[PDB]
Structures are given as C-alpha cells and as structure tokens.
PDB file of C-alpha atoms and ligand atoms in Angstrom:
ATOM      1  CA  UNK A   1       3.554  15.130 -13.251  1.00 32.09           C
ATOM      2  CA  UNK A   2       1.239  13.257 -15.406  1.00 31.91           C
ATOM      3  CA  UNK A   3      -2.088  11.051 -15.873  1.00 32.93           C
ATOM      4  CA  UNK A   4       0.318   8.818 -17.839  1.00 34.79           C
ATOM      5  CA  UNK A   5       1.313   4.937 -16.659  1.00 35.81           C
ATOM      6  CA  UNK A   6       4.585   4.029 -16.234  1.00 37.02           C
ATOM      7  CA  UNK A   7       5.480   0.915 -17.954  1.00 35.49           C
ATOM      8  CA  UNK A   8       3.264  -1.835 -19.343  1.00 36.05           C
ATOM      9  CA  UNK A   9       1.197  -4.051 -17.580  1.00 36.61           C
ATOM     10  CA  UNK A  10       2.706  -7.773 -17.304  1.00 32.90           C
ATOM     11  CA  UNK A  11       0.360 -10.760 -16.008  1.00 35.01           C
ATOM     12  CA  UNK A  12       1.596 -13.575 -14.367  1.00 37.43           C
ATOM     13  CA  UNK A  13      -0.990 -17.040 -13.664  1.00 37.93           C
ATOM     14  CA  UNK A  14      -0.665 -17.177  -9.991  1.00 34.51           C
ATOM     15  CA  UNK A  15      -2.935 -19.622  -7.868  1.00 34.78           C
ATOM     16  CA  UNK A  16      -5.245 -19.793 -11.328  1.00 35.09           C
ATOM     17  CA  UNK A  17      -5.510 -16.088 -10.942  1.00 32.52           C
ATOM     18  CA  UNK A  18      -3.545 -14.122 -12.859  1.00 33.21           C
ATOM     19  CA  UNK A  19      -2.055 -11.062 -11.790  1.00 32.83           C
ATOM     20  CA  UNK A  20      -0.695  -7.884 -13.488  1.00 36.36           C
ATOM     21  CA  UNK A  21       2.202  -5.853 -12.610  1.00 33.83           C
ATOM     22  CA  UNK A  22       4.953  -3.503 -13.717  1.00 34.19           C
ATOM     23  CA  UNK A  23       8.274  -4.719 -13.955  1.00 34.10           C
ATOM     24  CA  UNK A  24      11.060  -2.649 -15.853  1.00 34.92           C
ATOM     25  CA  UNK A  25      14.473  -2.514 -15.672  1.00 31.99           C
ATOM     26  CA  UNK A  26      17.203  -4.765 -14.231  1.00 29.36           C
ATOM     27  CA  UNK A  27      19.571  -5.378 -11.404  1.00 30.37           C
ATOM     28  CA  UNK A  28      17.828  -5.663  -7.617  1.00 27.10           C
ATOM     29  CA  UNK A  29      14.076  -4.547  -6.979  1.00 26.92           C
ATOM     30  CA  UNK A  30      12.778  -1.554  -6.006  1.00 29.39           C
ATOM     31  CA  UNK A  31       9.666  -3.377  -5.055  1.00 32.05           C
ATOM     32  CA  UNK A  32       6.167  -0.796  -4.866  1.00 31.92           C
ATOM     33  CA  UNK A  33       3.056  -1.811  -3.081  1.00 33.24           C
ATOM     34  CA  UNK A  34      -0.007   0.487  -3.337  1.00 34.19           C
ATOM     35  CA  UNK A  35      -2.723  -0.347  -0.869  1.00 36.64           C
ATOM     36  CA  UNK A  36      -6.294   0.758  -0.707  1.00 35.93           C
ATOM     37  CA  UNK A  37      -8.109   1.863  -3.260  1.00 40.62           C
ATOM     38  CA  UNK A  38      -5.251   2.211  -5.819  1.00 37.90           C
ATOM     39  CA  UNK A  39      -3.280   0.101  -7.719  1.00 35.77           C
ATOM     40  CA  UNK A  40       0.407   0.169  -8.945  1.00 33.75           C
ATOM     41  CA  UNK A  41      -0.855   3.478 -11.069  1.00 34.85           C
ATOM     42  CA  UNK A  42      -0.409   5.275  -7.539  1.00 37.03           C
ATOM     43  CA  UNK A  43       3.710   5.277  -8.305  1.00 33.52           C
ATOM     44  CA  UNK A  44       3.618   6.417 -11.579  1.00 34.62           C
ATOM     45  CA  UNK A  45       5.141   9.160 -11.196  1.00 37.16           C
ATOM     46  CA  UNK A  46       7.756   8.039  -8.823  1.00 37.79           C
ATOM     47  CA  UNK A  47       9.260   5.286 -10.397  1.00 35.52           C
ATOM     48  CA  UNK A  48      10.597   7.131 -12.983  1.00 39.81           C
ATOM     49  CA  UNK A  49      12.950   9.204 -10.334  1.00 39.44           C
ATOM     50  CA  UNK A  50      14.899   5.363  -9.884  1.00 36.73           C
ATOM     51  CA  UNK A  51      15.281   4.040 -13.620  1.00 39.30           C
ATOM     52  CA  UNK A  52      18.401   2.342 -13.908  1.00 40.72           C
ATOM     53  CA  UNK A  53      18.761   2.082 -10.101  1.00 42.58           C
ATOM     54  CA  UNK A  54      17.327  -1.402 -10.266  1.00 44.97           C
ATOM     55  CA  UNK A  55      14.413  -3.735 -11.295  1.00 43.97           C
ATOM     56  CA  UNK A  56      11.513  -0.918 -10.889  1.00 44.27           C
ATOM     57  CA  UNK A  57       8.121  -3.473  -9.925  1.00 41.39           C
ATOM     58  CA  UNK A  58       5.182  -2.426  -9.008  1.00 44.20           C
ATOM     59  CA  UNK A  59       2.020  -5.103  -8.583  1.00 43.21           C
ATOM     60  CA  UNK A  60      -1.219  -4.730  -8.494  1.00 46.03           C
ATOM     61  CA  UNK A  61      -2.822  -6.339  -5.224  1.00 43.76           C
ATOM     62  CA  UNK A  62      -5.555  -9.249  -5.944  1.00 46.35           C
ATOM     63  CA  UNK A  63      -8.823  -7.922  -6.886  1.00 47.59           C
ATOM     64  CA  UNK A  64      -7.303  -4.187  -7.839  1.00 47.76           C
ATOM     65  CA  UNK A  65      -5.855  -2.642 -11.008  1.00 50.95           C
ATOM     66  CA  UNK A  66      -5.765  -5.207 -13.592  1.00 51.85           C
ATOM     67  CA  UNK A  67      -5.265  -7.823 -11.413  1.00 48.70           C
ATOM     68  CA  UNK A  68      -8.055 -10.543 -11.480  1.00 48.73           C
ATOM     69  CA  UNK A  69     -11.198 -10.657  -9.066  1.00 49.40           C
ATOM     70  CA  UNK A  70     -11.677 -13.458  -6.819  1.00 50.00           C
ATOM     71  CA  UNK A  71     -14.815 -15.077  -7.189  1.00 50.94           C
ATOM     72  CA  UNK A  72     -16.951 -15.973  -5.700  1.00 50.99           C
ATOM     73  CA  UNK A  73     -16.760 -13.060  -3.792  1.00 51.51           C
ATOM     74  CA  UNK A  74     -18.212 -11.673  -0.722  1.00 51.12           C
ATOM     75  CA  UNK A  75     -18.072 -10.623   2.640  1.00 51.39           C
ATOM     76  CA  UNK A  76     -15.327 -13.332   3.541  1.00 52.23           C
ATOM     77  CA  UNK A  77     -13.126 -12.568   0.800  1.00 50.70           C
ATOM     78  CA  UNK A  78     -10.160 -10.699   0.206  1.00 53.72           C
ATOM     79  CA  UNK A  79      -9.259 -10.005   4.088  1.00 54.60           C
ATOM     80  CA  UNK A  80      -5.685  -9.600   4.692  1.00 52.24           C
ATOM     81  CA  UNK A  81      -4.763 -13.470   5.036  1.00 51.61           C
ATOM     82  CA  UNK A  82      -5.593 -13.903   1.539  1.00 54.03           C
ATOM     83  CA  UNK A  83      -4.335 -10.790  -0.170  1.00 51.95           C
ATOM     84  CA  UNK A  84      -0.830 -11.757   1.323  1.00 53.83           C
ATOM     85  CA  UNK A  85      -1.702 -15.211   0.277  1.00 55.34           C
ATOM     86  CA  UNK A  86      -1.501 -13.976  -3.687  1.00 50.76           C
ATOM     87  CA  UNK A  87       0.963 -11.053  -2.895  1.00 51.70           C
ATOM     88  CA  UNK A  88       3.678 -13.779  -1.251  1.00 47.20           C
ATOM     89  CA  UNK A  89       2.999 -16.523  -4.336  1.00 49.11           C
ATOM     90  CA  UNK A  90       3.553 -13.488  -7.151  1.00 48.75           C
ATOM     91  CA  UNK A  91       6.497 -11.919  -5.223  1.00 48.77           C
ATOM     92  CA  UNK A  92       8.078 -15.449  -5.158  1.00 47.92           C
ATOM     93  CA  UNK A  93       7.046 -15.958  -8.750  1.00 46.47           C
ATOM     94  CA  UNK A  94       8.890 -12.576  -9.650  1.00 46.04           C
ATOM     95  CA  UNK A  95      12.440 -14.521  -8.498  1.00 46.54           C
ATOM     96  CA  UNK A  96      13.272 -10.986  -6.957  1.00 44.83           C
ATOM     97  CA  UNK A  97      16.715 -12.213  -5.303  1.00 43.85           C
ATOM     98  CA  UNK A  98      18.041 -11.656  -1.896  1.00 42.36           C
ATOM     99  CA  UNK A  99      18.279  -7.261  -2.049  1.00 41.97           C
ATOM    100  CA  UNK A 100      15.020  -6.238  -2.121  1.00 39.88           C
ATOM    101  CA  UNK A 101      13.992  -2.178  -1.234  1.00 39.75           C
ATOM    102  CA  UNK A 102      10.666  -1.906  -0.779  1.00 37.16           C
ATOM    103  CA  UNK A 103       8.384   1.344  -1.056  1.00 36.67           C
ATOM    104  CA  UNK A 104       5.282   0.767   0.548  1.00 38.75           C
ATOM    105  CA  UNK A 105       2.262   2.801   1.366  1.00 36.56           C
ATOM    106  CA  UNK A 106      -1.096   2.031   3.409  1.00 34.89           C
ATOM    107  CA  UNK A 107      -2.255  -1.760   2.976  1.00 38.09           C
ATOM    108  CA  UNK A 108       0.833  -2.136   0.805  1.00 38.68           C
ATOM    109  CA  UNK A 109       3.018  -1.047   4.286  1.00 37.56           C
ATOM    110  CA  UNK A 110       1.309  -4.032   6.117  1.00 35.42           C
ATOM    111  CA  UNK A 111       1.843  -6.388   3.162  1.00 38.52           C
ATOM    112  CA  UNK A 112       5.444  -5.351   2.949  1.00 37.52           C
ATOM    113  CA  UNK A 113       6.010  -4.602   6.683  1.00 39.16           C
ATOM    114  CA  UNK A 114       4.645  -8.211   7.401  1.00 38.68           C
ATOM    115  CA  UNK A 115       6.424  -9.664   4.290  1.00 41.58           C
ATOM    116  CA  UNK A 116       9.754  -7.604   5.027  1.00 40.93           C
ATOM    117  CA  UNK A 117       9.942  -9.496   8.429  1.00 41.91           C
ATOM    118  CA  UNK A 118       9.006 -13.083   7.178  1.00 40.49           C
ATOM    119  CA  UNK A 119      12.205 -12.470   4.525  1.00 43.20           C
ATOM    120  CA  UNK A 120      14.578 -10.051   6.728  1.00 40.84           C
ATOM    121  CA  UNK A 121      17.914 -11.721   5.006  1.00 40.31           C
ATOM    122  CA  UNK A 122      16.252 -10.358   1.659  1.00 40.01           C
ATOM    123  CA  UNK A 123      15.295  -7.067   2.514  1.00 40.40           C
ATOM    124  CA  UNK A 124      17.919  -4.269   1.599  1.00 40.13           C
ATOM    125  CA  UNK A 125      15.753  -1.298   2.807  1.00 37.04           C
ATOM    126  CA  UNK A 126      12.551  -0.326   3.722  1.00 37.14           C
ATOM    127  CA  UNK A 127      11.020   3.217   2.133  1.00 36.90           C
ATOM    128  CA  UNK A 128       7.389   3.623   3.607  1.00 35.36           C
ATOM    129  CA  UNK A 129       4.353   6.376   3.919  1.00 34.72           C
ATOM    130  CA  UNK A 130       0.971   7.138   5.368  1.00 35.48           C
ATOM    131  CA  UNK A 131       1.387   3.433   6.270  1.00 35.56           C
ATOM    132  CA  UNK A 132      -0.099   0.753   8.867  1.00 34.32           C
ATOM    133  CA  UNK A 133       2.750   0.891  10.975  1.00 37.08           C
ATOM    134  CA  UNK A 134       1.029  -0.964  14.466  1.00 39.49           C
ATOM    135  CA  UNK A 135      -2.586  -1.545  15.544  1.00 42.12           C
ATOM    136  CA  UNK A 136      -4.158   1.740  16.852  1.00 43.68           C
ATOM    137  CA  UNK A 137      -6.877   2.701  18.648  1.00 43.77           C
ATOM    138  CA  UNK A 138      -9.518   4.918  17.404  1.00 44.92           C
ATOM    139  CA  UNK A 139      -8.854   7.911  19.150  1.00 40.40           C
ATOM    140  CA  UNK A 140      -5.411   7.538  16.583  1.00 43.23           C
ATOM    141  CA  UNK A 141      -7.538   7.162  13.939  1.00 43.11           C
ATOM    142  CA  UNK A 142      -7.793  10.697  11.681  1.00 44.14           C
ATOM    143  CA  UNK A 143     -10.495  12.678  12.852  1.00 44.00           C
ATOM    144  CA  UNK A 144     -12.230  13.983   9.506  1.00 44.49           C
ATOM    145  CA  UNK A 145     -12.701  10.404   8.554  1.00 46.18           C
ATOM    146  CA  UNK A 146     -13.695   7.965  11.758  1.00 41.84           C
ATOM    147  CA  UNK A 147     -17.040   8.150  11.354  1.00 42.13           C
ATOM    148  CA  UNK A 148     -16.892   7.354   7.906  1.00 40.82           C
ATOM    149  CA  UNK A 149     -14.069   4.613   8.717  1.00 42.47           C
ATOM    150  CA  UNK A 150     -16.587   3.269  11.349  1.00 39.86           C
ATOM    151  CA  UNK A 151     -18.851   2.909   9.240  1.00 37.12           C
ATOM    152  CA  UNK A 152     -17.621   0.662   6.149  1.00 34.76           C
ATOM    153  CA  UNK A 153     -17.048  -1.550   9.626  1.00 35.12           C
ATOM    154  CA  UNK A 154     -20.813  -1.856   9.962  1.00 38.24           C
ATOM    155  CA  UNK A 155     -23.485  -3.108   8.397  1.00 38.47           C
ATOM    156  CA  UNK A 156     -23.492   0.119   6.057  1.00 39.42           C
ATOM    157  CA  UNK A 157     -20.103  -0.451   4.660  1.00 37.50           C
ATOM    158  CA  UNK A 158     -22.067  -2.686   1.923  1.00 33.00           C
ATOM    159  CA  UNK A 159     -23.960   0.242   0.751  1.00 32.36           C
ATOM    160  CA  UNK A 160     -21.417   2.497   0.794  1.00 33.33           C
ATOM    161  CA  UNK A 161     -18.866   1.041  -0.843  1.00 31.77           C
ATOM    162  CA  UNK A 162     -20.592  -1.629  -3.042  1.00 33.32           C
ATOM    163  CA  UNK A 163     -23.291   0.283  -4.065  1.00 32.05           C
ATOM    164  CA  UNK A 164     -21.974   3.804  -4.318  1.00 35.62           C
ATOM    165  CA  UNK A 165     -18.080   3.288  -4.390  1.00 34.18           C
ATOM    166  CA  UNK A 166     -17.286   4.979  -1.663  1.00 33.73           C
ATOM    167  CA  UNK A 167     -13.592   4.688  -1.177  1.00 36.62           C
ATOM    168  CA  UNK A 168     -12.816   5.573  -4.713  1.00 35.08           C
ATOM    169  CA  UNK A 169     -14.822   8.632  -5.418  1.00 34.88           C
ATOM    170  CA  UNK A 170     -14.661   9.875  -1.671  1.00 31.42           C
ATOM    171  CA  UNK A 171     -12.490   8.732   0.703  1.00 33.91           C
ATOM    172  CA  UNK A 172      -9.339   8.615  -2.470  1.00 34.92           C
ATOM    173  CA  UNK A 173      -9.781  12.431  -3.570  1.00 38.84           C
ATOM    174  CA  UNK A 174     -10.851  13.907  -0.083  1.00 35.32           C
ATOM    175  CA  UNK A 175      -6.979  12.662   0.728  1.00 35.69           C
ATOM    176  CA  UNK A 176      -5.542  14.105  -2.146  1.00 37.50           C
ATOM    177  CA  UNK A 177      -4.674  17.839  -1.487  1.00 35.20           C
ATOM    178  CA  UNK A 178      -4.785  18.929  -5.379  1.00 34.94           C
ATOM    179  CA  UNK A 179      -7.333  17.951  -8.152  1.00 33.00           C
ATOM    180  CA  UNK A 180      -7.068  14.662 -10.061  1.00 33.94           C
ATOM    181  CA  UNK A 181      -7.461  14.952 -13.884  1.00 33.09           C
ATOM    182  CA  UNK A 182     -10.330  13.382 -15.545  1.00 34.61           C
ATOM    183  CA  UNK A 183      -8.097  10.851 -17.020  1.00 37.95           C
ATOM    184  CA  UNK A 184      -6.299  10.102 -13.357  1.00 40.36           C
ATOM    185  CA  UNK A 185     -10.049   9.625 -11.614  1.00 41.23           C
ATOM    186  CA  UNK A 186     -10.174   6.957 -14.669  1.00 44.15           C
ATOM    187  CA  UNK A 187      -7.317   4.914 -13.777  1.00 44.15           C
ATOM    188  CA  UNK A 188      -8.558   5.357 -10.235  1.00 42.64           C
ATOM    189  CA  UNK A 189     -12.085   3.860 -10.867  1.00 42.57           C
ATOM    190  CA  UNK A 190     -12.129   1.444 -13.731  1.00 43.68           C
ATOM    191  CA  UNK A 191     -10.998  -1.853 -11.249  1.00 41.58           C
ATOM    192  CA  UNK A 192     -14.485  -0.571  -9.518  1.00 43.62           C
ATOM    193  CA  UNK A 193     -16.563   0.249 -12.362  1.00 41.71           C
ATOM    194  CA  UNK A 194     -18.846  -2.245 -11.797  1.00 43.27           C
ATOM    195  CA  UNK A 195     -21.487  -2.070  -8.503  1.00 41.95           C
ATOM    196  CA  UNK A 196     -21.291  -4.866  -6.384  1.00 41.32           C
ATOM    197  CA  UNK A 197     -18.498  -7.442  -5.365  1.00 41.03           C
ATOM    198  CA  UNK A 198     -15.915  -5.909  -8.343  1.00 41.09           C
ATOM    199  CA  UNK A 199     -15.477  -3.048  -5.508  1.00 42.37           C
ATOM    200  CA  UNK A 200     -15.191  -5.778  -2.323  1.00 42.66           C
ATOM    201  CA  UNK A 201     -11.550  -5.083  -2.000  1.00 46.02           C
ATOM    202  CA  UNK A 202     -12.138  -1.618  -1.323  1.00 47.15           C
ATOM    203  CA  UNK A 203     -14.359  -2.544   1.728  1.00 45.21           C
ATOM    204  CA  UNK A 204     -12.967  -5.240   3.367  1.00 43.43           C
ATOM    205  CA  UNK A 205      -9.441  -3.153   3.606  1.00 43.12           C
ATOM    206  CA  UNK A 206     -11.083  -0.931   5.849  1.00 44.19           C
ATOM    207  CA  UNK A 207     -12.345  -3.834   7.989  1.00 44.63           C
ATOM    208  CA  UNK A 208      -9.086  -5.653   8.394  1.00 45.10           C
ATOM    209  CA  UNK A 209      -7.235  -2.349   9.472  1.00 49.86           C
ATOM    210  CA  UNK A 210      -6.373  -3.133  13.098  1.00 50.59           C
ATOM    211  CA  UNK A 211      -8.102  -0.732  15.270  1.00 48.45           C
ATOM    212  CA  UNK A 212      -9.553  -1.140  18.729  1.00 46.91           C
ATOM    213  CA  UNK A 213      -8.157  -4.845  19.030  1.00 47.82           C
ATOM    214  CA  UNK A 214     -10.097  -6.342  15.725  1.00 47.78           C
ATOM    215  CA  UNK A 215      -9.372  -8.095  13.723  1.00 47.09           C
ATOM    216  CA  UNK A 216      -7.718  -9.929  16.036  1.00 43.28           C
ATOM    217  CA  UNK A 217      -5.341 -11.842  13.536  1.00 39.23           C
ATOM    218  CA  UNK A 218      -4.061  -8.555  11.839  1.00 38.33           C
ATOM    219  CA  UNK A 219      -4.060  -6.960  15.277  1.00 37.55           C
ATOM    220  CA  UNK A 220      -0.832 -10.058  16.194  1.00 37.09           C
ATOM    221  CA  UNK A 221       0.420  -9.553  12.408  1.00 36.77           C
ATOM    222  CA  UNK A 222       1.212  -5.949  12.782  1.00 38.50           C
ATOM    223  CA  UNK A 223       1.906  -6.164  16.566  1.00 37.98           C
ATOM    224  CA  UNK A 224       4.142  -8.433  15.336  1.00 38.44           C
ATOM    225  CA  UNK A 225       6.056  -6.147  12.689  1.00 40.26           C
ATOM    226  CA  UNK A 226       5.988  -2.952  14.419  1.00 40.42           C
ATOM    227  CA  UNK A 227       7.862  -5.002  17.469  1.00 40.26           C
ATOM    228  CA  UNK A 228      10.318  -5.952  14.563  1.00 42.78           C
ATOM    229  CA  UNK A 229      10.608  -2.706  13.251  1.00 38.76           C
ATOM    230  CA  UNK A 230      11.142  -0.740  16.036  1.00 34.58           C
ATOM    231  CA  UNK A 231      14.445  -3.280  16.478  1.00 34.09           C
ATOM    232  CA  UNK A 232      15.737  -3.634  13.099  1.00 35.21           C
ATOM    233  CA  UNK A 233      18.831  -2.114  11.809  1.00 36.22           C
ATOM    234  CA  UNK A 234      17.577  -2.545   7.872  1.00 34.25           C
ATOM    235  CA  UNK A 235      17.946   0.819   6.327  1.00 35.05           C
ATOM    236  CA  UNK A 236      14.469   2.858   6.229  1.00 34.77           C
ATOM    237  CA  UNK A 237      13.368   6.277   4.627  1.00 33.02           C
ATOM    238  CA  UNK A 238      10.143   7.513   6.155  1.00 34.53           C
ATOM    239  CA  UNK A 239       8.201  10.147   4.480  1.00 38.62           C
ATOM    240  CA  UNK A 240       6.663  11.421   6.675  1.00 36.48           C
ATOM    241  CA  UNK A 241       3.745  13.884   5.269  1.00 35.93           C
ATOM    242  CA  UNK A 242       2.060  17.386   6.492  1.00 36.52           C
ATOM    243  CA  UNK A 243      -0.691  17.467   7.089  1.00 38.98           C
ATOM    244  CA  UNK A 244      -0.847  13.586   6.756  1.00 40.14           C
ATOM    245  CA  UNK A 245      -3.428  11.540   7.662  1.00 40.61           C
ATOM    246  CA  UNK A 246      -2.774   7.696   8.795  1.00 43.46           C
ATOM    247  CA  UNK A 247       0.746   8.024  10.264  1.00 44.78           C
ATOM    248  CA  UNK A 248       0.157  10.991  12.651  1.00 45.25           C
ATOM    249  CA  UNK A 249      -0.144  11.620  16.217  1.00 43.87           C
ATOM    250  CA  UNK A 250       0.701   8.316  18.065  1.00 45.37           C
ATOM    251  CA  UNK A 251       1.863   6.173  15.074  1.00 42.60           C
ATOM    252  CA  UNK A 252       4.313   8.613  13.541  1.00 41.84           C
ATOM    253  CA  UNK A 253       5.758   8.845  17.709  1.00 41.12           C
ATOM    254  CA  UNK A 254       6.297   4.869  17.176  1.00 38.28           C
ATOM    255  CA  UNK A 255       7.954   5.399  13.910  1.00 38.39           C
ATOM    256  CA  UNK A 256       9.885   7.603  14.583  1.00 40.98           C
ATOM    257  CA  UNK A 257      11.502   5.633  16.857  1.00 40.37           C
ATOM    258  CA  UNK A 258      12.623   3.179  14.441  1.00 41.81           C
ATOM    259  CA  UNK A 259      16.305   2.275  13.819  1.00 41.95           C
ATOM    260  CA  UNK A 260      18.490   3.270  11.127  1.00 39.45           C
ATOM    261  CA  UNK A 261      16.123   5.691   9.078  1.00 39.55           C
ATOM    262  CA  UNK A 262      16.201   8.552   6.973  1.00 39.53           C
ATOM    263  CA  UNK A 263      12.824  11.175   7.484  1.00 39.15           C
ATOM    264  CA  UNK A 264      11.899  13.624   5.032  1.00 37.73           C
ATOM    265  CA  UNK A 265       8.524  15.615   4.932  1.00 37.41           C
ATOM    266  CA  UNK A 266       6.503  16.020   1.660  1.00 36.60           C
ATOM    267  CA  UNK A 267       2.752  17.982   1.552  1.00 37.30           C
ATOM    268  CA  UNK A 268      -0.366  15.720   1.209  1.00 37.15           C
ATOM    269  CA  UNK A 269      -2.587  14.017   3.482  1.00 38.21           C
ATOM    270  CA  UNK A 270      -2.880   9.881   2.480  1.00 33.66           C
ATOM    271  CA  UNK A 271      -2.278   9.162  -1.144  1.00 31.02           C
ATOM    272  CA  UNK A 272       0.879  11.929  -0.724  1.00 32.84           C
ATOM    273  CA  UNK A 273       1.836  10.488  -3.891  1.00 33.19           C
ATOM    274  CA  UNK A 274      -0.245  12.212  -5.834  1.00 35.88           C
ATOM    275  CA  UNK A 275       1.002  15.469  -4.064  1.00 34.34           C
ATOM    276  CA  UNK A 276       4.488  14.866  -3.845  1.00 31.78           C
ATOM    277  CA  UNK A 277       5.366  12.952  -6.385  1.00 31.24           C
ATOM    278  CA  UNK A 278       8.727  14.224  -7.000  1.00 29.80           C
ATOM    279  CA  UNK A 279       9.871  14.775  -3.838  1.00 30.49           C
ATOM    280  CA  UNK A 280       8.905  11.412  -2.741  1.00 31.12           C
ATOM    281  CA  UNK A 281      10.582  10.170  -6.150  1.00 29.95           C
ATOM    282  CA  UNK A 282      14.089  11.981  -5.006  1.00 30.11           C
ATOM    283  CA  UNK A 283      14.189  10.852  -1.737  1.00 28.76           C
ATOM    284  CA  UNK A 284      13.845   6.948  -2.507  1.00 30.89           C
ATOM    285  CA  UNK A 285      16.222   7.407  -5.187  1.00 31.13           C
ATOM    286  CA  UNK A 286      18.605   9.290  -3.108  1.00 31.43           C
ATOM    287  CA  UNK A 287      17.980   6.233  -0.249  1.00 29.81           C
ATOM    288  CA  UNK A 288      18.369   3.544  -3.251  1.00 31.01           C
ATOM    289  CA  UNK A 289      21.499   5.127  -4.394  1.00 28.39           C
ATOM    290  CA  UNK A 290      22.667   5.137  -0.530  1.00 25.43           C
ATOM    291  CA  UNK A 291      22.485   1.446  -0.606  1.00 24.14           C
ATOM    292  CA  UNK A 292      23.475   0.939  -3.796  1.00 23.28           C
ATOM    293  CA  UNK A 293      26.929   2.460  -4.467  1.00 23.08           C
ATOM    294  CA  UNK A 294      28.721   1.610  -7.679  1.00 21.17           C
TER     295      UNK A 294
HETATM  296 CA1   CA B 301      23.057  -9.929  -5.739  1.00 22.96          CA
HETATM  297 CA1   CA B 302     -18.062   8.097  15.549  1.00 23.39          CA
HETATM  298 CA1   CA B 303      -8.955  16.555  -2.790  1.00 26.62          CA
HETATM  299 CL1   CL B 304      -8.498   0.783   4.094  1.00 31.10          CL
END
C-alpha cells in the first residue's frame, strides 16, 4: 500500500519530554498504539480506511519514532511502568473525550488493554491484534522465536539488541510475511540508528512481556485486564491472524472468549499490518462505523 506516512508528525512537551504523534481529523478518536519495535508508522496504511470516521491519532510510545529518548538511560529504564507513565500524561494531554476506539497491537494492546480498563466509561470499543492479551507461559510463547525471546531476557539481550539491533533488523522482518521496501526498513530503523541506549526500548519490551510469572508487576497488570476483558460488554473486533504469531494457541482460546466481539482473519504473522493492511483497515472501519451511526 505504500512506504508513505500518513499525516504529519505533531509534538506535544509532556513530563519535559516531548512527544510526537499523528492526529488528523475530527469528531471522537480512533486512538492507534504500535508496540515493539515500531512506531505510529506501523498504521499507515490503515488509518486512511477511517478518515472522516473520527479524530484518526496515532502516538509514538516514549523512546520510539520521533518521540524523545529518556536519558539517562539504561537497564532500568523504559519498563512498562514508565512507558504508561508518558503514554497516560500525552493521552490526557490529547483531551480525547469520553468515546474513545482504540486499535492496539503488541505492547500497544497492554498499554491500551491496561489503559482501556483504568478509563472503561471512556472507551467506545476495543479493535486489537497479535496483542498481549494475559501473562503466558513459555510453552505459549511462538516456537521459531523463544530462544531468541529468552535470550534478550539474559545477559545477552545487551549485545543483541544494543549492539546489533536485533529487534529491528531481525525479529521486525522475520514477522513480516512479504518484503519491506528500502524506504519502509528506513522508517523502521532510524529511532535505532544509533548503537547503544537509543535502541533500549527495543530490549526492555521483551523483558517486561509477562511470561513464566516475571515481571511480576506486569504479570498483576495484565492478569488484571485479561480478567476485565474476558467480562466486559465494550464492543471489540479481534483480528485474529494466520499464521500469527503472539495471539495463538492458548491466548487466542482466552480471547476468544471475550464478550461482545467481532473476529475476522487477515494473513501475517506479528506486525500483520504490514500484510494486511487493507483488510485490517476495512474491518476497523466497518467496526467504527458500527458504533458510530449517523
Ligand atoms: Ca461526545
Ligand atoms: Ca530455549
Ligand atoms: Ca519477512
Ligand atoms: Cl517485545
């Protein structure tokens, strides 16, 4: 569909940080949250299936896209606590009103998720892929990554992701079931450019996902959200993707349990929005429209 953005980039001064985002359009928010290691480029292709359907925003998480680094940075920094930390100060910044939708994906489904639940009264509907819908257990864990997975949580992670950038040049187009352009591997990679702590985002996601009971304090967050998931009657479209990747096997059991949603199936394995783009794009306008009627 295209290497091109959608949008401009808007920054916003939030706890002396600033932070950049999309934000087109008017009426309610269609809220996006990319996770890890993308930025709100991921939904550039998407957003354009729900212009005038409402506010279309899309930010980019602390540390990612154009979105300032912390710093100092390090080992202790940008865990979950303080991602949301940024994420809830810009979305309250945004003054995005009482119907939100949201359209989350991977650490953006835990942000949101965990947000969603903290805000229920606000939250029109929930639209959400390849996500972190409950702690799992490695054996859930996709098998052609664990190892690798197991390893940014050890001692290695440093090298590989630090050093040589591992989740952008790897893990991102090894989940991607067609080629990325030259000029999409661009936007992709120029957050993480630079060796070091610039790329520290992209390794400390992996160690806050809650597997095997740690970390302990996103194990309770998501416990948390899947229990109020699994009983809320908010409105919710799950893509649901073949051969996916993250929400497979045990997880996608649990969510498809959920109340009140919509499934559809698009081809692609994590980042599905890079396969799927339109498909995904029709569906959460079709779900937006749904709860939107004129
Ligand atoms: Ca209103
Ligand atoms: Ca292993
Ligand atoms: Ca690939
Ligand atoms: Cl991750």
């Amino acid at each position: 569909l295209g290497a091109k953005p959608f949008g401009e980039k808007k920054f916003i001064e939030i706890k002396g940080r600033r932070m950049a985002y999309i934000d087109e359009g008017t009426g309610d928010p269609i809220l996006f949250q990319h996770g890890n290691p993308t930025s709100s480029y991921l939904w550039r292709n998407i957003m354009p299936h729900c212009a005038g359907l409402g506010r279309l925003i899309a930010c980019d998480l602390i540390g990612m896209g154009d979105s300032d680094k912390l710093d100092p940075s390090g080992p202790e920094r940008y865990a979950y606590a303080e991602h949301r930390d940024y994420l809830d100060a810009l979305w309250e910044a945004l003054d995005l009103g009482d119907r939100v939708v949201l359209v989350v994906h991977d650490w953006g489904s835990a942000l949101g998720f965990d947000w969603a639940r903290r805000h229920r009264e606000r939250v029109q509907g929930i639209a959400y892929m390849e996500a972190i819908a409950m702690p799992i257990e490695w054996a859930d864990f996709p098998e052609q990554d664990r190892d690798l997975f197991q390893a940014f949580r050890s001692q290695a992670g440093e090298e590989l992701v630090l050093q040589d950038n591992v989740f952008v040049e790897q893990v991102l187009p090894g989940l991607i079931l067609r080629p990325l352009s030259e000029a999409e591997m661009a936007a992709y990679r120029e957050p993480f450019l630079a060796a070091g702590e610039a790329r520290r985002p992209t390794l400390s996601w992996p160690r806050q996902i809650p597997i095997a009971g740690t970390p302990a304090d996103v194990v309770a967050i998501a416990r948390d959200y899947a229990g109020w998931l699994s009983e809320s009657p908010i409105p919710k479209l799950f893509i649901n993707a073949e051969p996916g990747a993250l929400t497979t096997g045990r997880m996608r059991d649990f969510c498809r349990t959920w109340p009140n949603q919509t499934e559809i199936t698009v081809a692609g394995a994590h980042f599905i929005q890079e396969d799927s783009p339109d498909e995904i794009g029709a569906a959460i306008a079709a779900f937006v429209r749904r709860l939107r009627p004129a």
